[PDB]
Amino acid sequence: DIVMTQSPLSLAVTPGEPASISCRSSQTLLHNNGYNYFSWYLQKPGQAPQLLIYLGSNRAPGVSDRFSGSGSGTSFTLEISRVEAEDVGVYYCMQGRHTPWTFGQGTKVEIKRT
Amino acid sequence: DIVMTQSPLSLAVTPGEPASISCRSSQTLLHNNGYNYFSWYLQKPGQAPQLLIYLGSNRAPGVSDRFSGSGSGTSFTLEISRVEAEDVGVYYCMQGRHTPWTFGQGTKVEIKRT
Amino acid sequence: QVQLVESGGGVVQPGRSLRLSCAASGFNFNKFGMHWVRQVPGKGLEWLTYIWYDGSNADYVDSVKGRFTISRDNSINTLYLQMNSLRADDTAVYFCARGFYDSSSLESWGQGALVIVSSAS
Amino acid sequence: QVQLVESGGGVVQPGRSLRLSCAASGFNFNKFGMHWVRQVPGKGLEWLTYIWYDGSNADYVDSVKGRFTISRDNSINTLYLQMNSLRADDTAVYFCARGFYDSSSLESWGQGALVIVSSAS
Amino acid sequence: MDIDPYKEFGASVELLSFLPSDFFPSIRDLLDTASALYREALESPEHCSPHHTALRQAILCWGELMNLATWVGSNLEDPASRELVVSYVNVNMGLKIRQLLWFHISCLTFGRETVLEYLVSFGVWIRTPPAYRPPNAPILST
Amino acid sequence: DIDPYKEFGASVELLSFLPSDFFPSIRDLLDTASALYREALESPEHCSPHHTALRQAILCWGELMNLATWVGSNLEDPASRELVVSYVNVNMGLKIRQLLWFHISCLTFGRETVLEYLVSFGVWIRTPPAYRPPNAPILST
Amino acid sequence: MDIDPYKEFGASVELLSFLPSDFFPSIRDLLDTASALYRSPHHTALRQAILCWGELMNLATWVGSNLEDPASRELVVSYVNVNMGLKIRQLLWFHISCLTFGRETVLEYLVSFGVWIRTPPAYRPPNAPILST
Amino acid sequence: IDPYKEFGASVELLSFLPSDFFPSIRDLLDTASALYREALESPEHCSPHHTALRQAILCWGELMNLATWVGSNLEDPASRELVVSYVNVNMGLKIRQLLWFHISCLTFGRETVLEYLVSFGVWIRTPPAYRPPNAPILST
């Protein structure tokens, strides 16, 4: 039912510089508990997906501080202060306000060629 | 001092059928604690003896439920519900009412030939 | 950390039906829910269905609505996903996961298994 | 589970005397009694003697009464059985065991050792 | 720590714990009887007398509790959490409220000396060979 | 050479005639003592010998429970433990049940009626079951 | 249905509710003073509220111990220690103050606070009115 | 729940008395019997400590009966001993103590007992270097 959206589709980062990615959702995610149900996932070729941010603005256990995010309502952004060589992958955002669950379109990162 | 007795001397069992063996003692084994001092032992060729029933009517730890017995006073009986291929051996009964300790005569089991 | 291992994946002849195995251990299965995730090559993740601890309720997406079913056997703590009326668009690797951050996002993801349908061998 | 290993068994020339070794470990030797069991081929088990934890008391059967003796050294937790005036009827394998179901029937039985007497070698 | 609501009134906690839990009535029955027979008495702003402020304070806890239950109903999306908490709020903890309401109610009509002797006699009666006691249990009656 | 009930005008045989089923459980007696007479049980008062008997019975049986626990913890061989605990609990505790019921009843209703109840119960039991009235007399109030 | 602890004590819920939510004190220190300086049915009301708080604390601790799911904990704890304690603080303050100053020397204080708040901030006298000794 | 409370004493007050410096069992038995058999045998009911002793002697009788029964059965010598040694040594401290208390309060009056009991605490606390040689006796 919910239409998901992501942007930009691609973003190549010189490593050591900050970067931001934006994911947008149609319907509001502010429940009556003051919380927002939004997710940040990390996926690696040949590996299972891993968690990035939980509950909208809380870091998942064991995740390095290099990744941070914030936002509320229908707008959110994923920010990485310093890009490391192991950060290459395709990122996803998900919705869990109302069933059925819907996923985004994806965002893959790489190194800007010379 | 105590004369021990066992019967029957031999009993070949088609396996999967029940069987009973009887061991008799001359003097009563009912002490003033309400218990009877009688034993059931199992002996295998090339191996050390193993316990079957303890204290007359209590199963020894780790022994399978396939063997059971009961009785009191001067009469007791060993009953095996289902005979398995690993049950072949010579069985013994012992006395521990008064010193010195005395053993029985033995009872060996086998398979009835065709 | 909980470890989940799947089984039953492989090639299946067209027109038949297949069942996949996803068992879990090391945590209280009766106290948490389970979810199914699918990935055909070339696209991203897609949600399919989920079941609650009791199992009385269930939900499905419109793509496979009425043709897939999910059930759990709390005696052995094993998940089950039954596939019928398979199509060429269903060729994908399947993952079963668990979510416990207040019932929103999946936390531990299994290794997954791929399912392939075709006539050649 | 306690494990007991004997030693000292073997062939002995006629007319002499021999001593057998039976050591135990893994349980409280000072809190339990010990027993000796014998088996010549062709017959069944036969009780010989036993000793209490203190060792002050002992008993014997009429067959070997007054010719065998048993003693224990609680410092090293080792059993001892001394044989004198051996006869041709004494050729048998010897077992030392322990009983703890309320002091009635033996529970753990050692592997045993055989004793043989003869003149040929 | 020594917070015994019955201490000032002459009774004590162990006396209530003497009787089995299952013997006590439900909840809605107590609410209905109270509303039916003492609506004006509880509503009256007059000082009235002891046990009345007690009932007033007691009913309030039950009210709030049920407010919490109806609030958490809609929230707490997780099914398991929902059922467990709600059952705890209305199946385990209400025992004490029961006891309080029953004690007070029984005191109001049939007296105090009466409810105390009834309690002790019933406690003695239950614990005694079945064949060595009167056939009938002691009904409070008047 | 001791008659514990002689100080209240009763004898051992009076209670010995009472079967075992009549006395309640030990837990029941302890709970009654705790709930119904705790306030004055600890406090100091004159006379009231029944208080003194109850107080010393509670210590005696507590010591017996401590013995039961201590024997349970030790004595690795389970065979003896059953016999020991049986004798300590069911057989020895009979006297404790005997004394606790006597004194508790004496407190609630006094010597005036308990003695008559005892003599009446004895008279009822002595006769054979064939001509025994329907039910055993109840102490009542 | 028509229950309200304030009515029988000559007070109306309007007087006790006219005050703002921020004027009320915390619950840890109020509990401490109540226990320290104290031990009519007003005492029985104080004891009942004490019991209510204690049982709520027992509930919160137990739910923290069980309920392995992490998320629910924060919501349950916040609701019972923030929303469910405002009125508790209200009842304790109302049932405690009057034991020291007296009945009357309480109503007048409550009414004056309404006049003070109604006055626009610009024209409001600087002082912070208090009932004092 | 308090062994002595109603005599104006406390379990902590008796702590100062070391366990070893108590008298042997049979001495207290004899001292009670020989002196106060007549006191035991009377219709008068007073001096609760009389009945208390009557309870102490009954408890000792029951324990001795248990001891002989164990001696009769339980063939295993080790366990039998162990139990006999425990009942003889560890089991009698409380009884004893009780006997010392009452026997000794019916003879010397209560006030004399309370004085002796609080004073004896002095002896243990003082250091041997300057402690007086002798310790206090109940006297009379």
TrEMBL record, chain F:
| A biological process term (GO) from this entry | viral penetration into host nucleus
> For this protein, what post-translational modification is recorded in UniProt?
Phosphorylated by host SRPK1, SRPK2, and maybe protein kinase C or GAPDH. Phosphorylation is critical for pregenomic RNA packaging. Protein kinase C phosphorylation is stimulated by HBx protein and may play a role in transport of the viral genome to the nucleus at the late step during the viral replication cycle.
Q: Which domain of life is it from?
A: Viruses
Which N-terminal residues, if any, form the signal peptide? none
Compartment annotation? Virion; Host cytoplasm
Q: Which GO terms describe its cellular component?
A: host cell; host cell cytoplasm; T=4 icosahedral viral capsid
Provide the alphabetized UniProt keywords: Capsid protein, Cytoplasmic inwards viral transport, DNA-binding, Host cytoplasm, Host-virus interaction, Microtubular inwards viral transport, Phosphoprotein, Repeat, RNA-binding, T=4 icosahedral capsid protein, Viral penetration into host nucleus, Virion, Virus entry into host cell
Q: Which GO terms describe its molecular function?
A: DNA binding; RNA binding; structural molecule activity
Q: How is the subunit organization of this protein annotated in UniProt?
A: Homodimerizes, then multimerizes. Interacts with cytosol exposed regions of viral L glycoprotein present in the reticulum-to-Golgi compartment. Interacts with human FLNB. Phosphorylated form interacts with host importin alpha; this interaction depends on the exposure of the NLS, which itself depends upon genome maturation and/or phosphorylation of the capsid protein. Interacts with host NUP153.
Tell me which family the UniProt entry assigns to this protein.
Belongs to the orthohepadnavirus core antigen family.
Tell me the function of this protein.
Self assembles to form an icosahedral capsid. Most capsids appear to be large particles with an icosahedral symmetry of T=4 and consist of 240 copies of capsid protein, though a fraction forms smaller T=3 particles consisting of 180 capsid proteins. Entering capsids are transported along microtubules to the nucleus. Phosphorylation of the capsid is thought to induce exposure of nuclear localization signal in the C-terminal portion of the capsid protein that allows binding to the nuclear pore complex via the importin (karyopherin-) alpha and beta.
Mind telling me what this protein is named?
Capsid protein
Span of the entire protein shown here: 2 to 142 of 183
UniProtKB/TrEMBL annotation, chain H:
Localization terms from the record: Virion; Host cytoplasm
GO terms for cellular component: host cell; host cell cytoplasm; T=4 icosahedral viral capsid
Modification after translation is described as: Phosphorylated by host SRPK1, SRPK2, and maybe protein kinase C or GAPDH. Phosphorylation is critical for pregenomic RNA packaging. Protein kinase C phosphorylation is stimulated by HBx protein and may play a role in transport of the viral genome to the nucleus at the late step during the viral replication cycle.
GO BP term (any one): symbiont entry into host cell
Q: Does the keyword Zinc apply?
A: no
Q: Which UniProt keywords apply?
A: Capsid protein, Cytoplasmic inwards viral transport, DNA-binding, Host cytoplasm, Host-virus interaction, Microtubular inwards viral transport, Phosphoprotein, Repeat, RNA-binding, T=4 icosahedral capsid protein, Viral penetration into host nucleus, Virion, Virus entry into host cell
Q: Name one GO molecular function term.
A: RNA binding
Described by its record, this protein's role is as follows: Self assembles to form an icosahedral capsid. Most capsids appear to be large particles with an icosahedral symmetry of T=4 and consist of 240 copies of capsid protein, though a fraction forms smaller T=3 particles consisting of 180 capsid proteins. Entering capsids are transported along microtubules to the nucleus. Phosphorylation of the capsid is thought to induce exposure of nuclear localization signal in the C-terminal portion of the capsid protein that allows binding to the nuclear pore complex via the importin (karyopherin-) alpha and beta.
Assembly: Homodimerizes, then multimerizes. Interacts with cytosol exposed regions of viral L glycoprotein present in the reticulum-to-Golgi compartment. Interacts with human FLNB. Phosphorylated form interacts with host importin alpha; this interaction depends on the exposure of the NLS, which itself depends upon genome maturation and/or phosphorylation of the capsid protein. Interacts with host NUP153.
Q: Which family does it belong to?
A: Belongs to the orthohepadnavirus core antigen family.
Q: What is this protein's name?
A: Capsid protein
Q: Which organism is it from?
A: hepatitis B virus genotype C
Which residues of the whole protein are included? 3 to 142 of 183
